[PDB]
Structures are given as C-alpha cells and as structure tokens.
Amino acid sequence: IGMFVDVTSILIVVGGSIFVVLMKFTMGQFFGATKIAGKAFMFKADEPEDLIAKIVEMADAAINNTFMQKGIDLLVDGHDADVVRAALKKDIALTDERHTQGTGVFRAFGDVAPAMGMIGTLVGLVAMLSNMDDPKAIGPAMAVALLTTLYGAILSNMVFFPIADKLSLRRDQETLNRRLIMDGVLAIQDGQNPRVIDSYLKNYLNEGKRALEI
C-alpha cells in the first residue's frame, strides 16, 4: 500500500548505511561482496557424495567444478606434490577469506541499518512535533517515522543478516568440498586404489553443523 512506501525514509536508511559502510570498505570490495552473495544464492553447492563418486570414477580412468578442473589441469602439467599442496591450500584459504569478508561486509550493513533507522525516526518525530498545534493530525506524521524504523528493522533482520548467515554456511560447504577435492587430487597423484581412500574420506563428512544429522 502507499502508506508503507516513502522515498525520503528509504533514502535516509540506505544512504546512511551505504555511507557508513563505505567508510570501512572500498566500493570494489562492496561489489565483490555483492557478487559473492549473488553467486552463493543463485548457484547450489555440489553434494560431497557426488564429488566423492566423481573422484573415484576419475581415479581409475587415469567435469563440472572448476576447482577439480584446475586440479586435473595442473596434474596434466605435472607439478611436484609440494606445488600441488601449496596451490590448493592457497586457493582454499583465499576462498575462505573472501567469503569471510563478504560476511563481514553484510554484517556491517546489518548492524548499521537499524541505527540509521533510529536516526530517521528521530528526524520524523522532530518534524512531526514542530508542526503540531493540537494532537489530532499526527497520525501519518508518526507513521512515517515508524516506517523508517520498520525499514531499518526489516533490512537488518530479514535481508542483510540472512545473507551474512547464508554466506557463512556457503563458506563452510565450500571449504568442505575444497578439502574433499584436494584430498582426491592428492590421492590421484599418489596413484592409490579408489577404495582405500574412501575408507577414511567419509569419517569426517558430518563435521560441526552436520553433526546433528546422525
């Protein structure tokens, strides 16, 4: 309805939050974080079981995930095992830090939005009180301030914080899959049989968050 839309209020909230976040993050970092969130929302993380099946299917022969694609490309390049381990660990740590800082950006947005909503409703209350002769026509003048507060609360609780939590969850899943792929490529380079590695691979799948599934 038109009683829940206000250009000035959304301008105050979004402009204040953006200005405060830009104090601690460059614009390129913010765009990178938004790209991270979009990729983590639109694309689904590959199942670890599917990755294990693909690894054990490709082990005896000697493609969807780009990490294993770069792993097999480097294996064809025939680098030393130390080089493989270093490159894979560096990529995993880079992805981990990238997701962590995306989460930090979105948590900063979520923590800043309600304070800006409170500033906006303070401005609305001052504007209402400066134009009151009798306490009769102060309905919408309060509704706009409460609208600013509601915008702040909604953006903080249902838009930015859920994105940060989803980013953390996606970081955990990506770390798990990256570790599985790294172990698989190490085993393939070693040349061991497909079955022996699967004996110890599945012990730690249900780590931390997944501990509740069993």
Partner 1 sequence: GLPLWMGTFADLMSLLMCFFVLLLSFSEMDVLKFKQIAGSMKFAFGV
Q: What angle separates helix 27-42 from helix 7-22, to the nearest 10 degrees?
A: 110
* Interaction partner, residue 20 (a second copy, partner 1, none; CB < 5-8 Å by kind): a second copy
* Interaction partner, residue 205 (partner 1, a second copy, none; CB < 5-8 Å by kind): none
Question: Which parts of this chain interact with partner 1 (CB under 8 A)?
Answer: 1-3, 5-6, 111, 114-115, 117-118, 121-122, 124-126, 128-140, 142-143, 145-146, 149, 152-153, 156-157
* Interaction partner, residue 191 (partner 1, a second copy, none; CB < 5-8 Å by kind): none
DSSP designation for 157: I
Complex with a second copy: residue 112 or 187, whichever CB lies closer: 112
- CA–CA separation, 181 vs 173, rounded Å? 12
DSSP designation for 137: S
Residues 6+ apart with CB under 8 A from 138: 128, 132
DSSP designation for 47: P
* Interaction partner, residue 6 (a second copy, partner 1, none; CB < 5-8 Å by kind): partner 1
Whether the CB-CB separation of 149 and 118 falls below 8 Å is answered with yes
Distance of closest approach, residue 37 Cβ to a second copy, in angstroms: 11
Distance of closest approach, residue 124 Cβ to partner 1, in angstroms: 8
Complex with a second copy: residue 62 or 89, whichever CB lies closer: 89
